Amino acid sequence: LTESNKKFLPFQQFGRDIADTTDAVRDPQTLEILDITPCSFGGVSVITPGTNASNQVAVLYQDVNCTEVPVAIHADQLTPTWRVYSTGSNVFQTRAGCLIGAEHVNNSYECDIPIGAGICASYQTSQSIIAYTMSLGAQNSV
Amino acid sequence: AYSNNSIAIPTNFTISVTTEILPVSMTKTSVDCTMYICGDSTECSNLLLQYGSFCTQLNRALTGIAVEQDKNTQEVFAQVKQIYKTPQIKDFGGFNFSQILPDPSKPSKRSFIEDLLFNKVTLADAGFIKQYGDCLGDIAARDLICAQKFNGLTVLPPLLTDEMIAQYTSALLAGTITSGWTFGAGAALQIPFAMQMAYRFNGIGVTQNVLYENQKLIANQFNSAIGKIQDSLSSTASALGKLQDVVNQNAQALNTLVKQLSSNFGAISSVLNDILSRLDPPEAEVQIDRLITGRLQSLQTYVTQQLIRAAEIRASANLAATKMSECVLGQSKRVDFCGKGYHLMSFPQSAPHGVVFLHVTYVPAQEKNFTTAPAICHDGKAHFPREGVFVSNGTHWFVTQRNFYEPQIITTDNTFVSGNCDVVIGIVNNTVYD
Amino acid sequence: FNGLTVLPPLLTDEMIAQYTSALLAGTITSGWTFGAGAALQIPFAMQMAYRFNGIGVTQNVLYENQKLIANQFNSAIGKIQDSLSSTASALGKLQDVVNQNAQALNTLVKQLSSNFGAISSVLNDILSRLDPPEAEVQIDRLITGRLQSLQTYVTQQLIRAAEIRASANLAATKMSECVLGQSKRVDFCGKGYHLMSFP
Amino acid sequence: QYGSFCTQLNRALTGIAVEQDKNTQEVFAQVKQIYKTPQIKDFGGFNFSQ
Ligand SMILES: *[C@@H]1O[C@H](CO)[C@@H](O)[C@H](O)[C@H]1NC(C)=O
Ligand SMILES: *[C@@H]1O[C@H](CO)[C@@H](O)[C@H](O)[C@H]1NC(C)=O
Ligand SMILES: *[C@@H]1O[C@H](CO)[C@@H](O)[C@H](O)[C@H]1NC(C)=O
Ligand SMILES: *[C@@H]1O[C@H](CO)[C@@H](O)[C@H](O)[C@H]1NC(C)=O
Ligand SMILES: *[C@@H]1O[C@H](CO)[C@@H](O)[C@H](O)[C@H]1NC(C)=O
Ligand SMILES: *[C@@H]1O[C@H](CO)[C@@H](O)[C@H](O)[C@H]1NC(C)=O
Ligand SMILES: *[C@@H]1O[C@H](CO)[C@@H](O)[C@H](O)[C@H]1NC(C)=O
Ligand SMILES: *[C@@H]1O[C@H](CO)[C@@H](O)[C@H](O)[C@H]1NC(C)=O
Ligand SMILES: *[C@@H]1O[C@H](CO)[C@@H](O)[C@H](O)[C@H]1NC(C)=O
Ligand SMILES: *[C@@H]1O[C@H](CO)[C@@H](O)[C@H](O)[C@H]1NC(C)=O
Ligand SMILES: *[C@@H]1O[C@H](CO)[C@@H](O)[C@H](O)[C@H]1NC(C)=O
């Protein structure tokens, strides 16, 4: 529940969404409009090497800027060792959302784990997860 | 006007540039198994747990579709792994490639025709933007995108950005204009452009002296054809129907999937909230089960249509890859494969979720009827031309090539002797100077 | 009477025959020139010599043995006609497509008699015997079954349409390459060294 | 109360019919100039009457 700028009719009580969903509800005691948002965030992708390799993972949040990552995923009411992936230090912003848990490097290699928008991830040396811009090939001229 | 002794030989020619548009990939999507059916309800999720692995199969199929979309793009555009850069010079013997070569001025290194093509598609990339800040406190209701996002439906971005695709196309163009077809079979070997055009003319069956003697006219015709193509693109908008059709079909499918959430499917209400509010659980299981069955059938229908569309797009991408490899990386002798006429060259241009080919062909212009004979008789021997046909100007007899009128005096080098004059039918009498 | 109809094709068979006749006239009076632009006249023997040069045999071979080759062509056409007029299993593909479509439609019609778990498959004798709120359950079961049948039919139709589209693309390529020109691809326009094709 | 279940079926069937017509047009309409058969049959001994 949050505060809403929507205006209801004087006798209205509920607000319905396009897909027959409740959007905003008027509080019966204090006559204010509160909008309803699901607390489940869709668009979480887990980047991992094989389980035989390691247990480190890097989380990608789709279409979110990392200023409001803890707010979007409700990091307050989350267990520990998940609040680490919300407000971290290896925070990298891409056009496909922004990736937390991988160190950004300026060296371009061949794509290993495709993430999106020209960014690929790889597991390299001790060992850690690095993210980089994929390389199309060797530069040449005629 | 068929006759058994009449032939027609073209005298002039026209250089025409045509356009071909082929869809390569479609949008990649993901669906949340639980948030679409039983969104934010522990009871409904517990009930959905009793349906087994229904939605894991849907996720697997959608993942395969996305992977094959990326694979289609890679196969179409990553033929060469060496990124040749455009030369600083533009001395291509009168040919003007500025309309298709990259323009550094634009923020995205794209050419004029590419800018036209990307501006001709009215999609605005609706999957993008909406960075979870747009679906927040506002006076208006949710857009058609926030409804998809809040119900578990998402769009995955393509692996290759449009700038990388433009770089690939630019490398292909630079290679094909500075080396010919040699850069596809191995290392790129430099060659002046007029020589390459002479090689193509020899490939289509016209002697290279025709190109050499009329270089300026051919260059002007090519420039005019490119200008006409640019004007046609800048005037009309229905030439890009296929890409817009793919985008519209995918968007309509997603919108219908969202709008299907309001169906009752035989239950008291389509809203999950006001079933658990009014009905005690063991009585509510019936309504919840009906809703689950309906909403699970909707996803299966969506996934099946997506798989069929993906198969069609894969076929189109395979055709596009073959067209690139044959028309762009070489010269194709297949009829009606790289443009109507006699193929000379093709130029690739990037388009939104597609490719555009600029086929360059050779077309005869003006014909002239003549009198022809299969063979020429002599003192006990029959004569046939090595390469060409026999043509008479009413009084004399000449030999000329097939696709261009260039009469020559009949000598020993033109014709070879085989047999005698009685066996051949239609053999005429004329002198053969040595 | 149950809502299933067949739409007629846009092109009648006479228009298709006109198209094929135009293609035949062009390919016998001009060669391959009518596919690349304006049709240019040429005597037929010279066109056959051009094809012989295309397959790697000098045109004097055709010129010296014109009568024998013409007789062989006529005999081959006669044998093709006799084989067509004798057997009937050479057209299995078209008959198979027609039979599959007809069987699909007939099965869709015959599926209307399934109960799908209701008291009766006839809609009339449910509303005749059951009051509406009690009849809603039976009506819903029947609706679900008859709606699943249509979905199965449509999915099968889409798959068959994809196959037919692939076949049509192959046919168009074959027409453009074998009919409008001479093809050097092996086993694409007949076994051997291709000379010409007629649609 | 079942929503747009059958509109999708109608759309798919319409697309199938349209693509059938498109297939016929692509196969048979390669040339738009209707050449007529010549009055003569002097094709050097070749018989095309069948
Ligand atoms: C309802 O009662 C509470 C408690 O007295 C009060 O704070 C609130 O303003 C009241 N609301 C209305 C609409 O009367
Ligand atoms: C994981 O797979 C590799 C591949 O053979 C194997 O060498 C390794 O032992 C596996 N790890 C475990 C814990 O079995
Ligand atoms: C949200 O993301 C954009 C990226 O386009 C960024 O520029 C902006 O600063 C972010 N919001 C905040 C409050 O930082
Ligand atoms: C990589 O580039 C960024 C941006 O220029 C820079 O801040 C960072 O220090 C670079 N990393 C290294 C190891 O130099
Ligand atoms: C065919 O050629 C012969 C000469 O060999 C000529 O007499 C005859 O008129 C020609 N046929 C036609 C229809 O003109
Ligand atoms: C071919 O056409 C061009 C364009 O009209 C013309 O300038 C040129 O003179 C023509 N050539 C011949 C040989 O007629
Ligand atoms: C090529 O065309 C552009 C515009 O179409 C023109 O500005 C440029 O001067 C042309 N190139 C040459 C060498 O004239
Ligand atoms: C050449 O002559 C034939 C017969 O005399 C005639 O039918 C044909 O139209 C002529 N060609 C041209 C281009 O006039
Ligand atoms: C045909 O061309 C030759 C070549 O110059 C010329 O000598 C002859 O007079 C021409 N014939 C006619 C009928 O104009
Ligand atoms: C050419 O020679 C043949 C026999 O060798 C003869 O019948 C014919 O009349 C000759 N033609 C001319 C124009 O003299
Ligand atoms: C061509 O064949 C038909 C029957 O097969 C025959 O009637 C006709 O005479 C033949 N053509 C010629 C020129 O003999």
Numbering used by the authors:
A (entry chain A): 548 to 672, 681 to 697
B (entry chain B): 698 to 1131
C (entry chain C): 847 to 1045
D (entry chain C): 747 to 796
Please quote the paper that reports this structure.
In this study, we systematically investigated BANAL-52 and BANAL-103, which exhibit the closest genetic proximity to SARS-CoV-2, focusing on their spike structures and functional characteristics. The cell entry of coronavirus into host cells is a critical determinant of their infectivity and cross-species transmission, which is mainly mediated by the conformational change of the spike protein involving receptor recognition and membrane fusion. Second, Cryo-EM structural analyses revealed that BANAL-52 S is stabilized in a “locked” state through linoleic acid (LA) binding and an additional N370 glycan, whereas BANAL-103 S adopts a “closed” conformation due to a unique glycan network.
Cryo-EM data were collected for both BANAL-52 and BANAL-103 S ectodomains, yielding density maps at a resolution of 3.51 Å for BANAL-52 S and 3.11 Å for BANAL-103 S. For BANAL-103 S, the final model includes all residues from 15 to 1131 (excluding residues 72–74, 145–151, 246–252, and 673–680) along with glycans N-linked to 20 sites. In contrast, for BANAL-103 S, no LA density was detected in the cryo-EM map. However, it possesses two additional N-glycosylation sites (N112 and N366) located in the NTD and RBD, respectively. These sites, along with N161 and N230, form a more compact trapezoid glycan pocket that restricts the RBD conformational changes. Correlating these findings with their receptor-binding capabilities, we speculate that the extra N-glycosylation sites forming a compact glycan pocket maintain BANAL-103 S in a closed conformation, whereas BANAL-52 S is stabilized in a locked conformation due to the additional binding of LA to the RBD, resulting in even lower S-receptor binding. Compared to BANAL-52 and other SARS-CoV-2-related coronavirus spikes, the BANAL-103 spike contains two extra N-glycans linked to its RBD conformational change, which stabilize the spike in a closed conformation. These findings suggest that BANAL-103 S, with glycan binding capacity, would be more easily activated compared to BANAL-52 S, consistent with the biochemical assay results.
